[PDB]
Amino acid sequence: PEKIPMKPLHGPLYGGYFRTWHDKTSDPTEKDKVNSMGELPKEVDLAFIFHDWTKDYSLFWKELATKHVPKLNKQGTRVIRTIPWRFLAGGDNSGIAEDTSKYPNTPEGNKALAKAIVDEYVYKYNLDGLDVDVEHDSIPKVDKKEDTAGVERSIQVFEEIGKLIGPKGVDKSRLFIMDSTYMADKNPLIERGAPYINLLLVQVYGSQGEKGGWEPVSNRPEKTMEERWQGYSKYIRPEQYMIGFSFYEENAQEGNLWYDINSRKDEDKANGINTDITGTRAERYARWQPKTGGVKGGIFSYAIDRDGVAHQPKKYAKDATDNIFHSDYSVSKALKTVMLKDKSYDLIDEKDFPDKALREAVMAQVGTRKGDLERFNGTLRLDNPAIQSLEGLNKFKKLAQLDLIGLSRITKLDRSVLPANMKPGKDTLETVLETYKEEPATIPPVSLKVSGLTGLKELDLSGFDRETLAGLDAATLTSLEKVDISGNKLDLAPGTENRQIFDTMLSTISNHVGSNEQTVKFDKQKPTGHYPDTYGKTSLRLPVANEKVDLQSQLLFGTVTNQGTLINSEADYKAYQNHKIAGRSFVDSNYHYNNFKVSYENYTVKVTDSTLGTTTDKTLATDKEETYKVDFFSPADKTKAVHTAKVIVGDEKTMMVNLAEGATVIGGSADPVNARKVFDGQLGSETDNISLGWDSKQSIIFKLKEDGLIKHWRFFNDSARNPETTNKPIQEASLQIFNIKDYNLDNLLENPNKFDDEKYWITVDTYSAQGERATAFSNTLNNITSKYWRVVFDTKGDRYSSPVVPELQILGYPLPNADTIMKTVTTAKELSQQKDKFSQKMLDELKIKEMALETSLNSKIFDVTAINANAGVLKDCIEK
Ligand SMILES: [Ca+2]
Numbered sequence: 001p002e003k004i005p006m007k008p009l010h011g012p013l014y015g016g017y018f019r020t021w022h023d024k025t026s027d028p029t030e031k032d033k034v035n036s037m038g039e040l041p042k043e044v045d046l047a048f049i050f051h052d053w054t055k056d057y058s059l060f061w062k063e064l065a066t067k068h069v070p071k072l073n074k075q076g077t078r079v080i081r082t083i084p085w086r087f088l089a090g091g092d093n094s095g096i097a098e099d100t101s102k103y104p105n106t107p108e109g110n111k112a113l114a115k116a117i118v119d120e121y122v123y124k125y126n127l128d129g130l131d132v133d134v135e136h137d138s139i140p141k142v143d144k145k146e147d148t149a150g151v152e153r154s155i156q157v158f159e160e161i162g163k164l165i166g167p168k169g170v171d172k173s174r175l176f177i178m179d180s181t182y183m184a185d186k187n188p189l190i191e192r193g194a195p196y197i198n199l200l201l202v203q204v205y206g207s208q209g210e211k212g213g214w215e216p217v218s219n220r221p222e223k224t225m226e227e228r229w230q231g232y233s234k235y236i237r238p239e240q241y242m243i244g245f246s247f248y249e250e251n252a253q254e255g256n257l258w259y260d261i262n263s264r265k266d267e268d269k270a271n272g273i274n275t276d277i278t279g280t281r282a283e284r285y286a287r288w289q290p291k292t293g294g295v296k297g298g299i300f301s302y303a304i305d306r307d308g309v310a311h312q313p314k315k316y317a318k319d320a321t322d323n324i325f326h327s328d329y330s331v332s333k334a335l336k337t338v339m340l341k342d343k344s345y346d347l348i349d350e351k352d353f354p355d356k357a358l359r360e361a362v363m364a365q366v367g368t369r370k371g372d373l374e375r376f377n378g379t380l381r382l383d384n385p386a387i388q389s390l391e392g393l394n395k396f397k398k399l400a401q402l403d404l405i406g407l408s409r410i411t412k413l414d415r416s417v418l419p420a421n422m423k424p425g426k427d428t429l430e431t432v433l434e435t436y437k438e439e440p441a442t443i444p445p446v447s448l449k450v451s452g453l454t455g456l457k458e459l460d461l462s463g464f465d466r467e468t469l470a471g472l473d474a475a476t477l478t479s480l481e482k483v484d485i486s487g488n489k490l491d492l493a494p495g496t497e498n499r500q501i502f503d504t505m506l507s508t509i510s511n512h513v514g515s516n517e518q519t520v521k522f523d524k525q526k527p528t529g530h531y532p533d534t535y536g537k538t539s540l541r542l543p544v545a546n547e548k549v550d551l552q553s554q555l556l557f558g559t560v561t562n563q564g565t566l567i568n569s570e571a572d573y574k575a576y577q578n579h580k581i582a583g584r585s586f587v588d589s590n591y592h593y594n595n596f597k598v599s600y601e602n603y604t605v606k607v608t609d610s611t612l613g614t615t616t617d618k619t620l621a622t623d624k625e626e627t628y629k630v631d632f633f634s635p636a637d638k639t640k641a642v643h644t645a646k647v648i649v650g651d652e653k654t655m656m657v658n659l660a661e662g663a664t665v666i667g668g669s670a671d672p673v674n675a676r677k678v679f680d681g682q683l684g685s686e687t688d689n690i691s692l693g694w695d696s697k698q699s700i701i702f703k704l705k706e707d708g709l710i711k712h713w714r715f716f717n718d719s720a721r722n723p724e725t726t727n728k729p730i731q732e733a734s735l736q737i738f739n740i741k742d743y744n745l746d747n748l749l750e751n752p753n754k755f756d757d758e759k760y761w762i763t764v765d766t767y768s769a770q771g772e773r774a775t776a777f778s779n780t781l782n783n784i785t786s787k788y789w790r791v792v793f794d795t796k797g798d799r800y801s802s803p804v805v806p807e808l809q810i811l812g813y814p815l816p817n818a819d820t821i822m823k824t825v826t827t828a829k830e831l832s833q834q835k836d837k838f839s840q841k842m843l844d845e846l847k848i849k850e851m852a853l854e855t856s857l858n859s860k861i862f863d864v865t866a867i868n869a870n871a872g873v874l875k876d877c878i879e880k
Helices: 058-074 107-123 148-162 190-196 206-210 225-232 281-287 330-340 356-365 497-512 551-555 570-577 672-679 745-750 818-832 840-857 864-877
Strands: 013-019 046-050 078-084 129-134 175-180 199-203 213-215 220-222 241-246 298-302 379-382 401-405 447-451 458-460 482-484 539-542 548-550 604-609 619-621 626-633 641-649 664-667 697-703 708-716 732-738 761-768 776-784 788-794 808-814
Touching: 013 241, 013 330, 046 298, 058 078, 078 107, 078 175, 107 129, 107 148, 148 190, 175 190, 199 225, 206 281, 225 241, 241 281, 281 298, 281 330, 298 330, 356 379, 482 497, 548 551, 551 604, 551 626, 551 641, 664 672, 672 697, 708 818, 732 776, 761 776, 818 840, 818 864, 840 864
Parallel strands: 013 046, 013 298, 046 078, 078 129, 129 175, 175 199, 199 241, 241 298, 379 401, 401 447, 458 482, 539 641
Antiparallel strands: 213 220, 548 619, 604 626, 626 641, 664 697, 697 788, 708 776, 708 808, 732 761, 732 788
């Protein structure tokens, strides 16, 4: 039949999914189906056809096209064909797209598929639009496997369909609709599909759709109703957004029980009808509006053939409501009535914006509903010079950006003609949804840009707590005769951008009517205190004394304004407090240093000494001569330093390096793979098996990587990695170097585990645990130069008390030929004890060159060049 013309879509809308297998004409076999899709009331704006694609129902499609559609159109109801996502791709159950012959994955093939799709599902029965179901159940598949190529192809075709129908199509009278279960960032079709659709329908069935899901790990609601909208707010307009609940489907199973309408009473066994809307999730969905952006397009219901049917009680999730009922659609009519009482959908009129040019701009850029003014958080640009009055701007509650451009007829700017969110504030919009507990979100103040207002005589921005004056093109405000920027948070110190803008306005005013206390106001400012991006004090030299030092207060300090003004101390702020403009300060009298300064109270430190020993104490004792590296951390990020400084107590000592990191395990009675983990440079993961062996006494024979002079060593207990360790700490320990003087190195390498015995080695230090808890042990070493080492750990407990050592550090400074340098300095000592062989005068000259080398070897500032020189002087002196 010929298509009855219908008025353009105008929300708030009600949609409904009518399942085809519940229309009388669908299956003549049964008679329990007493419902008809043509019986849907005028209250329904969108009648969706949800079909069982395995069924034929040829009698239904005829009834639909010839009787249902004319009846529904005449009352103003549109009929939309719902097709699966996979119908746009190919593969399993893809309908038309199964025939790859006529519709290949080509540009012209996709273009042909799009035409065939609208031909078959839209125009064939003269329907009012196409609805694409995009969810997991409708995903493109090939042999039951999800197909990326299919999904990617379905992004096209969709674009091609959109060129035929929808707001960007040839036939705009046909709607193009996407319904989905996905979030925007999980919907691969929304980004390129959104410009082609009229409406986006989100399925939010059940309490999980309403409240969102409770995420276990975070102790916080995820995927909430507001988050879902916010995700799609990037792609569509609020008026295109429709949320959905579900009626009770007969014989519904677990996973399909939503309870979006009132359940059956646990005693009323003979009744399956409950047309009451009171307390339902559907009634709450009808009244729900987004907090930002604007008012929604409306709501929709699934299984609208089950309208009026009570839900099966939750107690029976493993009935009278499972019978088939003849619906009169009371619930649908009731919900549409609720949405029509929503005053949010009242049109923005001349009362809101008396100026026609302004009213037009708002209607184009924001919306047409009064409730959009409460929610719009985008950008309103006013660059139409015709605008004579800004009356109505105060109606904006959440506006993000306002551009006043070239409006040369405006003579005054104040709070009465500016957005209500000029000053800070919280969300006042009430919530209608159930929650798991609603903390009022912070409404960001509107960013204001004013340029070209050449007729502006008064500018009043007082008492808005404005953070900055950025946006004011003061040079263009040539008619200014009065200004008031007092009572904000502006930093008006000289050299700042805020000051530049103010001075320009001041100059204009002085020339016009003269600058006085009634034409120029700027005081009572409370500038915000911020953390500096960088810190200047990277070095601190302290004398050796019996004093404790607060590292934070001496290295990590300072508060900066958003204009760049850095205040490092109360003295700096006092100098800031008497910055004068026209003889008086701009800073509020009650805004003191403690009110302005940021707090470093919860910052943490990491102090590393020259032996690479670490502490986390913010207080440093200067009773010992030591050089430190100090890292500072913010509470927000404990693994990333906001500032690094060097602290030198007494004479500076060069920072040592772990010469044992990356060493090679050669032997020793220990797990060779875990033994390598004491040299990896980390404490390891708590979950990692790091035990050296089974016996309580394990040993490790290893080789260093770089020639160096060893001056220290350190090993950690398991408690350094895990404070709650059950592993027994190391009781006895020995650090050893190879006895290369009395034994052959070659024998050691060819068979290492034969030399896993003390006699082949020389103990250079011994550790005996005192008893108290200790995360590590460290000790000094007297200039050791051995490439090959041996270490023995022992917990001295029972067996199965494995020696657990997260790291072994052998510290010192890099020095090539260190082994040889110590040879010639050792020979110098040997010859000095041969007093029967050389004269005292020959020895005294030698001792000078000997004590010259030792001084450079033990020099606090480690000089490799000087060491080489003093070693060369000595070696030539020993020859002969
Ligand atoms: Ca380790």
